[PDB]
From a paper:
The native TsLI protein was crystallized without bound ligands and in complex with either 40 mM D-mannose or 15 mM D-fructose. In the mannose complex the β-D-mannopyranose tautomer clearly fitted into the electron density. The two complex structures of TsLI with a bound β-D-mannopyranose or β-D-fructofuranose are very similar overall, and superimpose with an RMSD of 0.2 Å. It was possible to trap the slowly reacting sugar substrates, mannose and fructose in the TsLI active site due to their reduced turnover rates. In contrast to other characterised lyxose isomerases that have been reported to have a broader substrate specificity especially towards D-mannose, TsLI is highly specific for D-lyxose, with other aldoses (each used at 10 mM), including D-mannose, D-talose, D-xylose and L-ribose utilised at significantly lower rates (<2%). The high specificity of the TsLI reaction towards the D-lyxose/D-xylulose pair seems to be due to the steric hindrance caused by the side chain of R175 that occupies part of the active site cavity. This contributes to a highly restrictive substrate binding pocket that is likely to reduce the binding of other pentose sugars and to also affect the positioning of the linear form of hexoses such as D-mannose for catalysis. The reduced activity of the enzyme with D-mannose is suggested to be due to the steric hindrance of R175 that makes the active site cavity too restrictive to bind other pentose sugars and restricts the hexose ring opening that is necessary for turnover.
Here we present the biochemical and physical characterisation of a thermostable lyxose isomerase from a Thermofilum species (TsLI) which shows high thermal stability and is highly specific for the substrate lyxose having little activity for other sugars. D-lyxose isomerase (LI, EC 5.3.1.15), is an important aldose-ketose isomerase reported to catalyze the reversible isomerization reaction between D-xylulose and D-lyxose, as well as between D-fructose and D-mannose and several other D- and L-sugar substrates. The overall fold of TsLI is a cupin-type β -barrel, with two α helices at the N-terminus, followed by the cupin barrel made up of two antiparallel β-sheets. The conserved manganese binding site is located within this pocket and is co-ordinated by the side chains of residues H75, H77, H143, and E88.
Numbering used by the authors:
A (entry chain AAA), B (entry chain AAA): -1 to 176
């Protein structure tokens, strides 16, 4: 249950690099140094965390590679409207492994995800979309969602409207995105 | 110098599938059937052509995979403003192979591309950007550009504002996009 040190960040960045290269996704040396490692401020990176390569992000489009270690969870959040921006719409495409995405709707029986008991209160949507390599789903703006990688981890691509991560809203009050 | 038949389209679609899978890019069966094969209406697909998988294309963002056979050329074009749309801005990322992209600016000496004599009149920009796997370049709207794959072909990803291919403007008057 540790604060996010320089050394933990390095270890996670190197692991995400290994995963990307094993999936045959080429990345430049400059990109290797720029991969973002977030524990969402929750201090258990291998439980709640994401390792992110931003390919491009501007007002007109965004694309990222979201690397997830085995059973890593992205905590529940929504990309809200901000001023006259509608909020981010995103399409996820699983490239490698598998991911369990949860969105609003009828609760899926026998969900695949496993959430710590202490954190169950912070997952409110339970309609399951399982994505395997090549499969996609689109999330409209201001929609609560979260995801957990399967037992071998996942690489999930994002194609989206502009990303403004600083303005995301997280169900878990403990989360600090940056 | 042949019209684009059902059989030529099938052959090219299958070759693009082989290339995608060799590059470890997963694609679904439905996507395999939906890959677009265009000879730009010029009747020499292996000289001028593109094989395209659209991942997603809506008013807020677009992402595609552009598959190019060895030395296949995308003829020169620009994505213009249309009404109050600025025109498409796109970022290209080479995933596999290599591609020679040409944009406006100072002519690059010793360009890598090889253009048929009959078609040289239709390439007006000659500032070369070579992209190898992992490398990117961004093209602003209404900018003339064209590209040729290297000797082993290329897979180039596009991340872009919405795509409206029907409205592209091509230097070569012979081109019919669809
Ligand atoms: O903000 C947390 C993360 O949420 C995921 O769903 C994606 O939207 C990422 O782009 C983002 O960085
Ligand atoms: O229209 C021809 C093609 O031009 C390429 O540069 C890309 O912009 C493709 O998306 C497009 O289909
Ligand atoms: Mn999201
Ligand atoms: Mn273009």
């Amino acid at each position: 249950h540790m604060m996010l040190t320089k050394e933990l960040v390095k270890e996670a960045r190197e692991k995400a690099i290994r995963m990307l290269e094993k999936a045959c996704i080429a990345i430049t040396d400059e990109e290797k140094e720029k991969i973002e490692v977030t524990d969402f401020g929750l201090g258990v990176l291998y439980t709640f965390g994401l390792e992110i390569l931003v390919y491009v992000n501007n007002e007109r489009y965004c694309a990222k590679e979201l690397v997830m270690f085995p059973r890593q969870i992205c905590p529940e959040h929504r990309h809200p409207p901000i001023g006259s921006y509608l909020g981010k719409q995103e399409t996820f495409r699983c490239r490698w492994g598998e991911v369990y995405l949860y969105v609003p709707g009828t609760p899926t029986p026998n969900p695949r995800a496993r959430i710590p008991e202490e954190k169950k209160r912070y997952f409110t949507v339970w309609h399951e979309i399982v994505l395997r390599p090549g499969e996609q789903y689109t999330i409209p703006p201001n929609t609560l969602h979260w995801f957990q990688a399967g037992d071998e981890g996942a690489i999930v691509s994002e194609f989206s409207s502009q990303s403004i991560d600083e303005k995301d809203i997280f169900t878990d009050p403990n989360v600090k995105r940056i």
